[PDB]
Amino acid sequence: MENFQKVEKIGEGVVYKARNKLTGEVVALKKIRLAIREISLLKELNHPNIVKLLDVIHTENKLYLVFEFLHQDLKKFMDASALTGIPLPLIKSYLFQLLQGLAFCHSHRVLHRDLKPQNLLINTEGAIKLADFGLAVTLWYRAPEILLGCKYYSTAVDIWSLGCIFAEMVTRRALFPGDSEIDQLFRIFRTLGTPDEVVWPGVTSMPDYKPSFPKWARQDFSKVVPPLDEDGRSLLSQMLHYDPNKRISAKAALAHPFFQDVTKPVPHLRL
Numbered sequence: 641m642e643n644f645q646k647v648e649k650i651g652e653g654v655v656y657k658a659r660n661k662l663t664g665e666v667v668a669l670k671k672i673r674l675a676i677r678e679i680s681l682l683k684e685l686n687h688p689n690i691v692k693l694l695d696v697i698h699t700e701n702k703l704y705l706v707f708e709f710l711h712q713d714l715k716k717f718m719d720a721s722a723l724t725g726i727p728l729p730l731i732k733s734y735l736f737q738l739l740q741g742l743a744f745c746h747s748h749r750v751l752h753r754d755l756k757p758q759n760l761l762i763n764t765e766g767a768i769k770l771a772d773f774g775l776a777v778t779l780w781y782r783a784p785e786i787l788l789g790c791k792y793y794s795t796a797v798d799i800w801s802l803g804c805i806f807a808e809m810v811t812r813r814a815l816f817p818g819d820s821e822i823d824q825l826f827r828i829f830r831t832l833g834t835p836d837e838v839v840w841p842g843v844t845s846m847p848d849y850k851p852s853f854p855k856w857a858r859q860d861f862s863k864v865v866p867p868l869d870e871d872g873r874s875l876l877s878q879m880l881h882y883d884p885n886k887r888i889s890a891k892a893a894l895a896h897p898f899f900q901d902v903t904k905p906v907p908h909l910r911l
């Protein structure tokens with residue numbers, strides 16, 4: 641670890657941009673403080689659309705995770721495109737790539753659990769990668785089953801989160817900017833309608849389900865993410881299904897007609 645030289649803090653454990661004094665390579669260091677080699681498997685989980693975990697340095701009373709370093713996260717890129725708006729071809733490519741990474745680790749029975757713009761990294765080659773996988777403060781992207789107390793949720797929670805992000809890239813506003821758990825759950829219910837046994841069997845048996853939840857109708861998906869086309873709205877619709885079992889999987893999402901004309905644009909980045 642005396643092998644590394646900090647360059648700057650880039651994320652808040654904390655994450656630093658570091659320079660390996662020997663290899664001379666620049667990386668991202670995750671400093672963790674406050675017993676599972678779930679991490680040891682993550683180490684072998686390599687894919688072009690997943691930020692690579694280079695090393696795990698366990699010494700003293702700290703745990704440092706050395707990762708591949710990308711220059712910009714999707715959040716910063718979105719604000720930089722706020723007035724112009726991320727072009728659809730670029731949006732499509734990004735969606736497509738993330739779905740590739742998710743399909744990959746999901747087939748390995750590994751979930752990210754906390755997908756969000758800041759956990760998505762981009763480079764100048766037009767690539768976007770999943771970063772900072774969580775292990776078993778913003779609730780904006782949490783799927784409803786989690787919000788409802790599901791202890792053993794599936795890979796479908798990453799799809800929900802990605803769907804929210806998809807919606808954000810298109811509209812340039814958070815789909816569900818909740819500021820507390822109930823508020824998050826209620827902003828979700830206000831948009832897609834309160835879930836019931838019809839559209840989500842077993843929902844009322846969810847640990848935090850409350851028969852007293854207000855009952856809202858589902859608003860038209862045409863009001864949710866304009867001016868996205870029919871294909872896009874069809875895909876988002878299936879990524880946002882209440883029932884985790886009916887929610888589309890990453891793999892099947894790859895075959896959605898929306899990705900028929902998918903290309904790989906190269907973003908104009910201002911590093």
Ligand SMILES: NCCNc1cc(-c2ccc[nH]2)c2c3c(ccc(F)c13)NC2=O
Pocket residue numbers: 650651652655668670691707708709710711712713758759761771772
């Ligand atoms: N999700 C909070 C911050 N986490 C990481 C951020 C970055 C990053 C931000 C701006 C540029 N880069 C990186 C990053 C990483 C590996 C693991 C991480 F958790 C983060 N490699 C990175 O480049």
